[PDB]
Amino acid sequence: SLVSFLTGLGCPNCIEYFTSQGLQSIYHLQNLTIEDLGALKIPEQYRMTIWRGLQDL
């Protein structure tokens, strides 16, 4: 789901950022903040995309 998620959102290149920290679940992924995404060195371009998307779930 994580892999599909980032891909169906158009940012499979963001996958490493999460799996690099041991993040692989969608649950855990939802309670991250916009600041968290930034700490996870995620490109300022996909931050809200992802964040918004995770809010939806």
Give the three-class secondary structure for 41. coil
Structural determination approach: X-ray
**CA-atom Rg of the chain in angstroms:** 10
Which domains does the chain possess?
1-57 (1.10.150.50)
Contact between 56 and 12 (Cβ < 8 Å)? no
Cβ-Cβ contacts under 8 Å for 42 (sequence gap 6 or more): 14, 17, 50
Q: Which runs of consecutive H residues, i.e. helices, occur in 1-57?
A: 2-8, 15-19, 26-30, 34-39, 47-56
CA distances from 42 to 8, 17, 28 (A): 17, 7, 17
For the chain, the residues before each gap (C–N > 2.5 Å) are none
Alpha carbon distance 48, 12 (integer Å):
15
